[PDB]
Write a protein that binds this ligand. Structure first.
Ligand code: NAI
Ligand code: NAI
Ligand code: NAI
Ligand code: NAI
Ligand code: GAG
Ligand code: GAG
Ligand code: GAG
Ligand code: GAG
Lengths: 315, 315, 315, 315
């Protein structure tokens, strides 16, 4: 009334799961855009039939034309590469995707500016904290209308691994990972809760040890690598994390979700994007929340921002 | 496969909303039992038609016969009175319901013992922390198979009021109220979080003040009174809280939910029921969680248990 | 984005269930309006707390002021009486509600015209086929923006009773009841299907007999009477039927649902409202579907319209 | 209570979407089994993290060991090949998959018989009407405990294409395709309804023509080919169709769904599996529904069964 229009700029693995979940949730009409001929039309057709099983009514259409961005309410950008040519799975690193994806953001930004300047934008392409700011600058959208994927996905892993050890519902574990999405991500032990209760209480009771937590932290940071080596660059959880973000915006839920956003003095940083809890609703990024970090935690945050800055320079 | 059987012992205001929500969620077959002739059959019939609108397949039937408890998987007890004869709305107090509801629990316990000794039991009738233990003793069920409603409902109010002030999604506020359901309920300021973040951070930032919180605490304790005076003994939120508990059991969610349970040394107390976080799954009460309270917080907990003990003596 | 505003003009039994279901489905902000002081504020408060259990974010507020209609996207009218003073339960008839509810529609129509002329309106108050046209004329809204409750509720009963006999999922039975909501409702045996298959096939196979169907038809027509005598004027299924209608409009589902709508030559009738399948989406009543009735079926339809005309004259 | 165990025998494209949808719906614990080393463990890990976003609690684990079938409640078989080596996309035919998949069913049947003889089985591998009977014979399960995918998927396409032309909710179109899943599938024009109304009424009103329907029928039969040529052997709708079937069994919905089942005289056929409407609930295939086909329709059904028989002979 009237349905939102959601344009998926990139119709690969993450794009396909996102289209599926949108139909399941009846969130809006979908366009699967890509540079590859024919493929998005085929995925769209397959996905469109699920409206019957789902009791939904969302159109799903394919596109090879940039001007189909016209009228978009939400734009989700996964366009680019997942690995660098020559690299083995063992040496997979998000940093190596910098030279491959830079110009793709510039091109997409020009089309957004021309076709849908009032859309809400979610950037996924890696390295995400660099790419999101590049797209912000080239699309011209307000700072409250663009974010990057990172923390919702990283914390889903940390939350899940802890919930399995303690035998509680996964969503009952809450946790914060900040700064950047990548190997310098900052995992904040002090801000973990289980059922709203400080995790330290469960450590005091010998229900989970400090050593067990250290191993879970290392597993969290290396999850994408672990999967890439067993199967492929992950796509199912990434997709689910992006849809939780888009849903909060579309339905005005005002959920607190950790995403990459423009910093204007928080943590001592300006003129750069970084991961922090934000509130997402009808007005986009409605609130940027600054965690009251200690000096040891701030020092790790600074390390993460330094890495985004280094790659920003090379783009 | 095969559907669970859920017997609502009491088919009044809370019973009706529970039957409605069960059909909405397709949770199982429902029996609305009551001593009043004809009424439960009428409510059951009305409710049964919603299977069509809901795409569900749950039977809903009325009953005036105790032996329909046979085969029950979950039994939810709301039977009793909501106010004491002679009392004005202004002097409404849960304690005054003690003489009115005592024998009703004994009678129901004998029927459970005979008809469905392996069922999971949820007690609602007031004063709840007294009635639940009375039913435990007369039904003979194991301590992991019976709980009382309190904390899920009380914290929903505290969580909601804070979420409105801060403009975030209601379920993003987490909070703990313990000891007993009633005027001595213990509201734990130290264990409030917003998006997993300590509420004290939002107080430090002047987003919510200490004085505003004190007013919200008083409102929480007096909510039932506030509504009773405007309309009636509350029924919609109570119903929703009970169904969240029953759902966690039926689907093995393992949610951490604050409920009245048998204490065996936690907080220094034994041989009595009191409100504390528990884990609810396929095996019933799978874990009893003891909050590591300070001495000031323990002193308030002791006051709440003393009140349950006082009424236990008068029953 | 931004949430719809849904004003419930009337906060009694049906109003309360509607507010509950809206929060469960996260459909929009709710206003419970009524002439009774204090009561809607109490129901609103109780209902608002369920946002926590439901993972929703819908405001629920009470009102005793007509100008709170300002900005409404959907208006649902249940205001009026459910029984006539002096009548016994046994002699309960919707026709007797004509003198009691006539002026209430005129008053509400003037407030809609002034405050929210672009809202979508659903009328429930009895006798519904008369009241809906009265409100259409006094509110000034376009014919595609107002409908009355009838067929979704009446067919839910017929569909349910047949599904129980044949042991299939309730929503798998489809059926049509047309003309008017009341004792002259027209039940169309020829248009019943089970799993998309003509019901006559199941009759040929002795899975259900013609005599069994006649008894089910009589039960359908007399359901409200059956419940009224056991309990009260029904409210849970009515509420669920209204929300299915409002949901189809809000989410642009384009469901085919039988409702009371302005006839402009269909079935040979003009200048009156009557029950027929319609398509509900973003544009309101998007299509009015005319069943290709035979002469025997048309004769019954004519009887139903004659009754609406008779009462229209007495209003 | 306790959760169902669902073993996906085959962890390729359809297996991955099924695991995702199971977690979304909280249907049960999942095992992704496959002969490929490492891959199912990687997909399982990725998928497991979505429990957080979904508010679910389903384990998802990978397997390369047949004995992990032990304790299975539902077994879903997609193991095999999707295309024949040497064939171009243009000459893709399900019949060519007969020599490639025959022994795989025999092997899996022996493991089911040994490990989970009381499980409910859904067969997907092509040619499906042949493979399902082969697995029935080698697994030893009762005829009410095994079915094949076909009609739910084929009719989703027909239902969807018609709903787009008429502009109504997709699930409001009902339709029957029977006999076999493949190029001889039987599309029954006489059994199409829209909102429970005979499609012929919409043809009489010039809302859709006979010629338009012929083109939609041809598109339905050739959909898999259309997609295969644009992208790949379809996987998203197939997955959704299988989960609707498994869900009806697990939750005792008793939905009428068209599937491949053992015929014992229906349509004049015995000792073979073929597509027809069935009722799926707690007891498996609870009812086999025989459509009262005319002689022209029966002649097409006979053509479809002849093809299954021909390939059965070559296996
Ligand atoms: N930020 C995060 O937490 C995560 C980020 N990522 C990143 O997301 C991206 C997508 O991953 P997948 O979907 O698995 O990759 P994928 O390779 O399956 O899909 C990417 C698609 O982009 C298309 N493409 C290239 N240029 C385009 C253009 N100009 N316009 C539209 N489409 C274009 C390609 O043809 C391809 O279909 C990668 O860069 C990955 O590193 C992935 C997971 C998580
Ligand atoms: N524990 C908690 O957080 C809360 C507890 N309560 C308590 O729940 C109870 C129910 O409240 P409502 O449903 O609003 O009251 P209600 O008065 O509308 O319904 C109670 C029903 O119990 C029936 N009943 C009496 N004896 C019975 C018996 N032997 N077997 C079966 N039914 C019997 C009555 O006829 C009546 O229909 C009250 O005691 C209330 O104080 C209410 C809200 C919250
Ligand atoms: N069309 C249908 O298929 C059905 C129609 N109905 C009709 O719906 C109506 C409502 O039924 P219930 O909710 O059970 O009745 P109810 O009596 O519980 O509630 C009606 C409310 O309207 C209020 N009211 C009176 N004048 C008003 C005004 N000017 N503005 C706002 N509120 C006003 C009353 O104070 C009362 O709270 C009845 O007329 C009933 O006959 C009921 C069921 C089905
Ligand atoms: N019945 C129907 O309506 C439809 C049937 N189909 C059929 O479903 C099958 C699966 O299709 P997709 O998932 O797209 O194919 P896919 O090729 O992506 O996956 C099949 C998987 O089976 C595995 N496999 C081989 N032998 C196995 C064994 N002994 N045990 C366990 N796994 C084994 C392979 O390694 C592969 O991962 C195909 O035969 C296809 O033709 C596909 C769609 C619809
Ligand atoms: O973290 C992940 O899962 C990722 C997969 O591809 N790029 C990533 O960053
Ligand atoms: O807290 C409430 O809402 C209650 C209503 O009736 N008894 C109660 O305890
Ligand atoms: O049909 C029903 O259920 C009704 C209840 O109150 N008025 C009605 O028409
Ligand atoms: O019908 C389809 O979609 C199919 C895909 O792979 N085999 C099939 O039969």
């Amino acid at each position: 009334a009237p349905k939102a229009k959601i344009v998926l700029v990139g119709s690969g693995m993450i794009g396909g799961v996102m289209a599926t979940l949108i139909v399941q949730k009846n969130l809006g009409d979908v366009v699967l855009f890509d540079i590859v001929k024919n493929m998005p039309h085929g995925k769209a057709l397959d996905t469109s039939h699920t409206n019957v099983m789902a009791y939904s009514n969302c159109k799903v259409s394919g596109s090879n034309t940039y001007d189909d961005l016209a009228g978009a309410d939400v734009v989700i950008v996964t366009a680019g590469f997942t690995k660098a040519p020559g690299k083995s799975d063992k040496e997979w690193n998000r940093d190596d995707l910098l030279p491959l994806n830079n110009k793709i953001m510039i091109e997409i930004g020009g089309h957004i500016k021309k076709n849908c300047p009032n859309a809400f934008i979610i950037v996924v392409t890696n390295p995400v904290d660099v790419m999101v700011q590049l797209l912000h600058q080239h699309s011209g959208v307000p700072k409250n209308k663009i974010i990057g994927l990172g923390g919702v996905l990283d914390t889903s892993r940390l939350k899940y691994y802890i919930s399995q050890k303690l035998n509680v519902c996964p969503r009952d574990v809450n946790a914060h990972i900040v700064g950047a999405h990548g190997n310098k991500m900052v995992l904040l032990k002090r801000y973990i809760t289980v059922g709203g209760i400080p995790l330290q209480e469960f450590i005091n009771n010998k229900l989970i040890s400090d050593a067990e937590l250290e191993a879970i932290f290392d597993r969290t940071v290396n999850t994408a690598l672990e999967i890439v080596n067993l199967h492929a660059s992950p796509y199912v959880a990434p997709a689910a994390a992006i849809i939780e973000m888009a849903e909060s915006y579309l339905k005005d839920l005002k959920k607190v979700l950790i995403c990459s956003t423009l910093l204007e003095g928080q943590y001592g940083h300006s003129d750069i994007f970084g991961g922090t809890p934000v509130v997402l609703g009808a007005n986009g990024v409605e609130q940027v929340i600054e965690l009251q970090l200690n000096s040891e935690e701030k020092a790790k945050f600074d390390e993460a921002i330094a890495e985004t800055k280094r790659m920003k320079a090379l783009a």
